[PDB]
Amino acid sequence: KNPKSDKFKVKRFHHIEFWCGDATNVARRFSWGLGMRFSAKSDLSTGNMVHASYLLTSGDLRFLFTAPYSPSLSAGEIKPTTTASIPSFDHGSCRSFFSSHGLGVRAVAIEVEDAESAFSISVANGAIPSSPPIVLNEAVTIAEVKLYGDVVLRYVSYKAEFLPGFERVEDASSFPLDYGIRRLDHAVGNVPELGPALTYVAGFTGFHQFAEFTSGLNSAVLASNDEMVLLPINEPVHGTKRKSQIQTYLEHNEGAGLQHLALMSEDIFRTLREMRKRSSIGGFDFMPSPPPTYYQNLKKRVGDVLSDDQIKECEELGILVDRDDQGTLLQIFTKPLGDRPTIFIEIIQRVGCMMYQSGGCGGFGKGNFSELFKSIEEYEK
Amino acid sequence: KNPKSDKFKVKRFHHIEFWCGDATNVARRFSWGLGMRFSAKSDLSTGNMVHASYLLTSGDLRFLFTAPYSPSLSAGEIKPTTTASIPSFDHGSCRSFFSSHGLGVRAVAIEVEDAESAFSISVANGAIPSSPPIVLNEAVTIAEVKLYGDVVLRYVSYKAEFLPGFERVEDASSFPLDYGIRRLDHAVGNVPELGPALTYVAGFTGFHQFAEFTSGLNSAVLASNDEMVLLPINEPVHGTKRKSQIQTYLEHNEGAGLQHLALMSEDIFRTLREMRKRSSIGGFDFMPSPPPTYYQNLKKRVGDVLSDDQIKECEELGILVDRDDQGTLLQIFTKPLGDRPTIFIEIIQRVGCMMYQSGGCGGFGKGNFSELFKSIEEYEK
Numbered sequence: 001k002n003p004k005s006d007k008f009k010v011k012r013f014h015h016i017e018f019w020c021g022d023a024t025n026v027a028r029r030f031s032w033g034l035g036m037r038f039s040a041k042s043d044l045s046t047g048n049m050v051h052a053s054y055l056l057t058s059g060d061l062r063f064l065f066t067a068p069y070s071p072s073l074s075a076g077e078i079k080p081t082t083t084a085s086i087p088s089f090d091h092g093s094c095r096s097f098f099s100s101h102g103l104g105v106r107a108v109a110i111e112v113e114d115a116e117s118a119f120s121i122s123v124a125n126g127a128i129p130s131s132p133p134i135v136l137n138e139a140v141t142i143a144e145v146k147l148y149g150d151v152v153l154r155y156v157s158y159k160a161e162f163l164p165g166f167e168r169v170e171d172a173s174s175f176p177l178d179y180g181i182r183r184l185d186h187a188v189g190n191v192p193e194l195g196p197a198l199t200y201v202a203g204f205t206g207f208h209q210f211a212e213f214t215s216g217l218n219s220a221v222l223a224s225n226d227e228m229v230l231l232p233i234n235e236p237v238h239g240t241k242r243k244s245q246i247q248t249y250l251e252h253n254e255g256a257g258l259q260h261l262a263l264m265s266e267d268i269f270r271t272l273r274e275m276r277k278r279s280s281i282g283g284f285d286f287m288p289s290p291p292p293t294y295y296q297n298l299k300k301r302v303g304d305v306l307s308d309d310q311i312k313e314c315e316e317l318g319i320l321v322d323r324d325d326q327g328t329l330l331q332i333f334t335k336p337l338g339d340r341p342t343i344f345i346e347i348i349q350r351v352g353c354m355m356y357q358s359g360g361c362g363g364f365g366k367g368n369f370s371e372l373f374k375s376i377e378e379y380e381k
Numbered sequence: 382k383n384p385k386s387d388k389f390k391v392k393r394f395h396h397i398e399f400w401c402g403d404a405t406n407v408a409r410r411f412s413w414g415l416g417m418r419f420s421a422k423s424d425l426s427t428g429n430m431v432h433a434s435y436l437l438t439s440g441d442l443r444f445l446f447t448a449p450y451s452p453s454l455s456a457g458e459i460k461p462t463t464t465a466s467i468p469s470f471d472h473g474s475c476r477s478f479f480s481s482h483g484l485g486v487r488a489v490a491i492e493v494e495d496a497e498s499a500f501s502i503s504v505a506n507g508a509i510p511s512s513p514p515i516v517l518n519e520a521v522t523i524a525e526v527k528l529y530g531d532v533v534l535r536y537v538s539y540k541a542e543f544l545p546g547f548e549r550v551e552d553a554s555s556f557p558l559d560y561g562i563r564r565l566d567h568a569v570g571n572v573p574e575l576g577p578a579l580t581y582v583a584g585f586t587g588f589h590q591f592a593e594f595t596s597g598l599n600s601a602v603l604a605s606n607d608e609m610v611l612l613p614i615n616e617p618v619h620g621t622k623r624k625s626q627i628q629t630y631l632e633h634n635e636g637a638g639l640q641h642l643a644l645m646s647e648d649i650f651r652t653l654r655e656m657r658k659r660s661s662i663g664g665f666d667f668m669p670s671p672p673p674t675y676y677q678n679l680k681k682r683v684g685d686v687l688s689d690d691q692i693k694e695c696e697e698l699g700i701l702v703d704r705d706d707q708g709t710l711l712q713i714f715t716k717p718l719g720d721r722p723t724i725f726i727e728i729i730q731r732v733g734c735m736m737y738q739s740g741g742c743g744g745f746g747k748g749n750f751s752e753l754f755k756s757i758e759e760y761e762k
């Protein structure tokens with residue numbers, strides 16, 4: 001069921017902002033590893049004395065990387081005279097975030113009809129305010145509320161190119177890399193307590209429950225009216241024979257935070273060929289592949305959806321496949337993006353639910369816990 | 382003149398350690414941009430609960446990238462029970478360094494005969510102690526004294542593979558990149574006051590003055606007995622019509638620190654072809670090239686050393702050339718390595734002074750201040 005209970009008009013995921021120690025090095029690593037183009041900047045060269053911010057894009061996917069400069073560069077500024085392009089930025093908050101959590105997502109940004117009304121309605125319905133609505137160059141409004149941990153949900157609304165004060169990048173520095181990634185599919189948080197987390201976020205957004213599951217974890221998915229904004233949340237389950245990976249996350253992250261970003265590809269085969277070619281030359285590593293028993297069992301499970309050759313290509317690339325009563329999901333997971341065993345990336349492509357494709361088509365891979373464990377037991381034999 | 386006045390036996394540059402917020406992303410960016418192989422690690426996977434450290438190598442050049450984990454992972458440890466592989470590492474010192482200076486060099490490490498005697502003699506001769514001599518696995522001794530700012534001079538001595546507690550990297554994660562870089566030629570500091578800086582370092586090392594110059598700066602070079610360890614130091618000169626780039630460094634770095642690392646290549650043409658191919662896909666950018674008038678004037682200055690075709694290749698790659706009474710220097714400079722206009726890299730190759738090649742052959746490029754400014758005036762006409 002979809003009660004379509006959003007308390008304000010939500011459009012799509014807009015961008016993800018990482019808080020970094022050095023934005024330059026993280027942005028360049030991510031650009032090469034994911035095939036994203038350097039598309040906009042706000043830094044000393046654009047008159048920003050406060051923070052360095054670099055925007056990468058692939059299709060509709062937008063990753064922003066931000067780090068603070070020395071506060072001495074802007075010591076005489078006040079908020080009414082700031083040279084920062086992102087008004088919510090604060091030197092101390094950014095340094096405290098990075099010192100506590102390491103590299104990670106500070107902001108999950110969604111485009112809304114009206115960021116001022118989204119903020120006001122959210123706070124009226126229980127959201128903890130983080131940054132009030134600010135109008136930039138009479139063209140864009142930005143506001144932020146607490147999502148979980150030190151992650152904020154950022155609302156952006158446009159009157160009528162990323163943000164005022166950002167400059168488009170010189171084409172020489174903008175190499176047109178593209179490995180097929182096209183948009184953010186879902187963004188997943190880890191929290192100590194799922195119930196309170198869900199009650200809080202669904203309380204101020206009106207997002208409805210899309211899915212739920214139970215492994216070492218319990219999860220549920222919150223969704224916007226058209227189910228294009230998807231926010232799953234996990235909690236650890238204690239008492240299992242193996243330690244919860246959610247609990248390991250919370251320990252190494254110093255608490256709740258964003259666990260993974262799932263990035264939709266228009267051609268997951270091409271994306272994984274390109275990413276795997278670069279794993280050991282500056283890119284991203286992938287989790288160990290399933291045993292060949294997993295791919296033998298795939299023919300029995302999705303042989304009507306994928307040809308034998310298409311299943312062989314999944315096997316070559318380490319791609320996992322799960323299936324709904326409605327759709328089929330192709331997915332694979334990276335190793336952690338940085339030093340700590342915390343945030344990682346998922347690459348996904350969905351088959352089915354054509355109407356445009358409906359959001360969440362095929363689910364989130366819950367069937368691959370059992371199928372993988374079973375295939376692992378079969379391979380040892 | 383070379384009085385050969387070293388107060389202890391010094392061998393060669395051993396490694397450079399960067400203090401980072403996220404060692405993984407900086408190391409991967411540097412590996413791809415410079416053509417350095419991932420060769421050793423000390424991190425959670427090797428039992429280090431304190432810091433993540435990744436070693437890149439190209440020839441004899443060793444770059445180490447280190448970042449702290451959450452202190453909560455090691456809260457019960459004490460120094461006698463530490464799982465850190467580098468005993469001088471301290472969570473607070475590392476976070477304070479990175480918060481203050483951003484990405485930069487913490488340690489300039491030289492291999493010595495006996496790190497305990499090097500430390501004791503240094504401190505007896507005025508060096509400020511930073512970390513006392515510690516014997517690792519009865520095999521390696523490491524000690525540190527203050528060099529300038531928050532940069533330390535690190536002594537390493539070996540009884541008889543980087544450091545105990547580091548593990549060699551699995552060959553799949555070790556891609557054999559190589560763009561021709563082979564060793565560290567010199568490491569340059571910026572300080573507010575050259576005289577006191579020189580008196581201090583030469584006082585505790587016995588290093589002698591190799592060279593001196595005067596642009597916006599004054600510089601002098603300290604050198605070991607065989608002039609293979611070369612430590613230039615710059616100070617700003619105020620009153621010039623253009624603001625001293627040394628002063629800009631000090632402002633953005635929050636004080637003294639390491640300005641550039643000059644990396645010797647066995648084939649600077651190949652190194653620059655390879656680095657420039659990668660500038661916009663995760664690598665390093667280079668400073669704007671000299672006008673064609675600079676390369677027309679090169680024929681008059683080094684036409685007996687470099688053929689016309691070799692000068693054309695310098696022109697294609699933006700390479701600068703200077704000449705001594707003894708040798709010829711090919712050099713080029715990167716843009717800053719990170720967000721701040723502070724640390725950068727120089728690629729160099731030296732021609733002449735064959736005996737092996739003598740250290741510092743051809744100088745450090747002082748002639749290229751005048752030659753470049755003159756060529757710039759000639760091009761406008």
Ligand SMILES: Cn1nnnc1NC(=O)c1cccc2c1n(C)c(=O)n2Cc1ccccc1Cl
Nearest residue numbers: 186188219232287333364365366367368369372
């Ligand atoms: C709840 N939720 N909502 N949106 N996304 C999510 N969770 C995930 O994507 C997700 C995150 C981590 C592990 C997963 C996930 N899934 C769906 C699985 O099947 N595994 C098992 C698995 C995967 C790859 C290699 C070995 C194994 Cl053992």
Ligand SMILES: Cn1nnnc1NC(=O)c1cccc2c1n(C)c(=O)n2Cc1ccccc1Cl
Nearest residue numbers: 567569600613668714745746747748749750753
């Ligand atoms: C003192 N010292 N000791 N060891 N190294 C050093 N200094 C340097 O390498 C050095 C560092 C920054 C600028 C320099 C340097 N040199 C030698 C030059 O000629 N310029 C002028 C120049 C270079 C490239 C593009 C335009 C220009 Cl304008």
Ligand SMILES: [Co+2]
Nearest residue numbers: 188262346364
């Ligand atoms: Co997922």
Ligand SMILES: [Co+2]
Nearest residue numbers: 569643727745
């Ligand atoms: Co130099």
